[PDB]
Design a protein around this nucleic acid. Sequence first.
RNA 1: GGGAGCUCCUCCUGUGUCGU
RNA 2: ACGACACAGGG
Lengths: 139, 117, 927, 73
Amino acid sequence: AAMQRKLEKMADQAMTQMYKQARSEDKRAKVTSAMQTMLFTMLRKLDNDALNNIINNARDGCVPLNIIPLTTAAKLMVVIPDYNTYKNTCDGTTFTYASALWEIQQVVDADSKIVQLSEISMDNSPNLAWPLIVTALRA
Amino acid sequence: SEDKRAKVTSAMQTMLFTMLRKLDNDALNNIINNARDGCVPLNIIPLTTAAKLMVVIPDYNTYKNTCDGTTFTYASALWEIQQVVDADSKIVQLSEISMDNSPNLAWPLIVTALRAN
Amino acid sequence: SADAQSFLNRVCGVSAARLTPCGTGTSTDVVYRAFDIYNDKVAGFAKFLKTNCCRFQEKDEDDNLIDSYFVVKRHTFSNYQHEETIYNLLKDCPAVAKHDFFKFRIDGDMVPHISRQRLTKYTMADLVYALRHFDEGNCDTLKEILVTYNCCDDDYFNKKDWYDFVENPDILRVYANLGERVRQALLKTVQFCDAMRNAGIVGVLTLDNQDLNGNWYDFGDFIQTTPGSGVPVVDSYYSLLMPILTLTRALTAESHVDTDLTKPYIKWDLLKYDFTEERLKLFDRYFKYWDQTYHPNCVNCLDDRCILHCANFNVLFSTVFPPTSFGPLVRKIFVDGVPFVVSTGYHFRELGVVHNQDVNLHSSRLSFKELLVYAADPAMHAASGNLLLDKRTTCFSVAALTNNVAFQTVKPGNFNKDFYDFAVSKGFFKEGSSVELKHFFFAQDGNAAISDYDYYRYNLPTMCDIRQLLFVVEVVDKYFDCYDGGCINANQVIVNNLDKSAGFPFNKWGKARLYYDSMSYEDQDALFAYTKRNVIPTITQMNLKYAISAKNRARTVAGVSICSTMTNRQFHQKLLKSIAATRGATVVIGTSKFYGGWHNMLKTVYSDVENPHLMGWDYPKCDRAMPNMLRIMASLVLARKHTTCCSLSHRFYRLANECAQVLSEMVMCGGSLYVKPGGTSSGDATTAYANSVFNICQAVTANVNALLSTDGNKIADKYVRNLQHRLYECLYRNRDVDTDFVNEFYAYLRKHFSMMILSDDAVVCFNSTYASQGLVASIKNFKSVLYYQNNVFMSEAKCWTETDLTKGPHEFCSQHTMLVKQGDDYVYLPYPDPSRILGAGCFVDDIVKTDGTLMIERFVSLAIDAYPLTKHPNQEYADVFHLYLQYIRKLHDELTGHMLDMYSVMLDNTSRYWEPEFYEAMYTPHT
Amino acid sequence: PSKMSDVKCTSVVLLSVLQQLRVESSSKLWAQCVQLHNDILLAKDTTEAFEKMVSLLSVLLSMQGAVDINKLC
RNA sequence: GGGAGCUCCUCCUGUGUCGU
RNA sequence: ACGACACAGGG
Ligand SMILES: [Zn+2]
Ligand SMILES: [Zn+2]
């Protein structure tokens, strides 16, 4: 009679608590990896030519070393791992990054040795170590 | 109700008898025995008897004006600087607290000093 | 003109001065000087048209003008001879201007003149009025006074917010530049009173008869007596002058060696805490003829009105003494030959020195309640800690309890991407829309806790007008008469949330349940009886708050000890429960807004006002800037319910405990102890009720200032004119309490100024005609009162006014009003900001709140709150509610789809949340 | 939808990811990130908000904790 | 107490589950 | 209508 309905309600309320516990544990565990996927999902959805260039550079290797500054007189340095990542990113002394024009000051090598902007050419490229940290200010 | 009571009683009296041994010394006994009726304000017990000072300095101008050197003066006493750290609880050397090396370190700096005899 | 030239030559006369005729050879009719008059026809502190003086101005060499005038009165002949006789007696006093009585043929026959010399342009009454009735757009006299006496320059007024106390706090220095002038005026007043007494003169000393140099004149209402038996009446003078004594820091010269501002500060002894004879000396030096008893230690006061009076004087005098002499007073106590250091007293800035009564040395053991009161005492915590010099704040720092400083940060909120995707799928969050996300979880860095604690720099020592305050308090007491209070036993306390913290240092060993279970009922009763004879100072712990908001400012919350709450419950809970259970009163606390509570509240405020307008204001930095005198007043009107269960000593020691624990306790911010100057405590139970008391107090003060500052000769109503006359008479004359007029003024307020008060949030329905005529308070009156009694500037852009009652209040408790048709009746429903509901839905403070299917009740409550938006004329506002219902439906559908999948099968009463009948019935009266 | 709300939600998620990567262990860096986040949440124009988003994303990318090639693909 | 990352505040109101 | 638990809104 009523006792069977009471036992049924008890089973239901005992199952809808173990379900909540399982889902809560699952969300607690899967965090720090679903949040990064969500972040990049909603970053590719913005479609900004400033964020997209940074993301492409970073997935190829041209990563910054400090916070990118939004002031005209501040200073920025990045890491150029390859030659092709330099041949298309920079021309002469004008640096193109984060949809802004930057002007190179000094280019240090992997041994903290200043390598000149005239020596960085396609022919005499492969005789370096090529983590060429370059420095620049936005124009 | 009857077992938690004894536990918290032991805990409270252990805390009291612990912070009591860090307190009783000649400084306190000497500043209380100078009062006319054994009663002194609380705000002057650490100001006069404490053997360690902690200074929290937000800027470099405040550091230059307050704790410049290895010994400074505060509350009518000489303090000897030791173990100055930054907001990350990392040891900072006295040679690094400069005007041009100021943006390279985390503020505020927490200076620890011992009263000089 | 030969007439004017001869009149000028006679006005100069003997004292060689170069005078220029400011005005003409007739009266000048000065533009609206402030007067303090009380006669059979008018009474009040207002601005009148003085028109019986022929002023002149004196110029030194180089022919440039000075701030020294020759005022020449032209009254009658009997008053001429009377003033001449009265002046011939006080002539030798140095605080008396020259007068040079003479007769000059003006209209053909020897009009008599009285020519006082070298006074000033303005008068102490003008300074007090300018600083009390402060209008930021009509402050010409204040500017001229500040420039004339070299406190600042016109370039200082060229800047913006120059008058503000929160923005530009340099106005405090600019004001304090007048302190020595005000203090020399006080000294001249005391000299004049002494001369009047020694000469046998009886008369009232009013502010409008004294220069800004201090000299006195206008001996028109003075009577002779036997020499040595004179008596000056100085109630209104000192009472009106008091609020600007602490604004201008008049007693700063008393902190120096020879009471002059050039010598070094007094090197007070560091072990000294009494300062009673110093306070008596200050009183006898500056208020010699204030003829009411002053008790430096308020433990000897006769009632709570005496406590208010003497605490006002104490809050004035405590600014002279070193700030390291206040706070608990510790003593060496032996516990089985082992020395302790425990508080055996307290030195308050307002209540003076108070000593505990149950202090026992040489004890063989400590009981449980003795362990509690010794562990809650900051004496042993600060005595065994390290000295601290915190250069980040200007507040007093006692000691650091740890070796490291704690830097506590706040996290960003969690993004509920499913709800946001659903919303933008329904057409929400478009470009240039009506609803936009404006409420987020703002993050904070490590420097947030101490930078928020530093906002206590807005709490300044405020000396109040006591003759006004101890009448406003009677009116507030009339406002709090329908309630029932008193003390309750330990088995009558209704404690909810018994699994929370117990403050510092009790949170190291358990929750509140631990201490409510370890203490018996008689143990709690013994603790409560202990707090009625001894002062227990406690520590409160400040930590950040993790909540959604619209401003990027950090919000801190306080957690007070378990002793403070355990005893304040037994003290105040009966009255608090009674306040929160009364429907239809002024203080609407505990009145729900559902089932027609909003409509009932609004219909109660609208009660019977004749030409009703609505009004509402704010208090800038209310919790930080609330002066200590008003907090003491609130505590006193709350404890006024204990007239049968406690004696005078019990009530005073409960007031002292309240102060030491909630008003000026030791704050533990991080791992360090600081001294809190004043304000309200967040984790106190009675703070929302003290705020209501303070709100009603400020409103009544604005009303009395609005009624007393109008020209009584322009009030057409005889009843209101006589009410203003009797209001002045009951404030500044009539030292006793006139219950009849208190009832009459309370009825006047309730009839023409109807209030709806919560914690520092108010809505007023006032008579618009009486307000436009100046008979009840307006917004400018609240601005003035807050400026001179709260040390804040209330911007008129934060206050609203509604001239149509079918439109409800603009905002009350962050809720808007809307007249909705609900079954043949038009009711007032409260609706929130749609951005608040959407932000509560989109950003959560815990990660599992993003699953949705686990938190359907969370959306049901949000839809309950967002239902009234469905009646709004804007369409996006109703779309909010429909969105919430559709999301609840989708959540239940996918919960079912998951329960049927991961388990075998499942089956009930959820369809009642997909339809608006539930939330609609949530807003109608029961039956 | 819009572009301001999108970048505000994305800044919230950026600061969450950066807090998970233990950036609060650097007072200077966490202060800068908090300032950029709070300035994005209060901005009205969608031109400087993208600049602060550039700065915050640069903060995230200048580390070597979060892999950026598997996330991009 | 359960839960979360040595710590998790107060007052009021309202829902939803449970038990009298 | 009375307590426990969870949630939601308003210093
Ligand atoms: Zn008294
Ligand atoms: Zn009582």
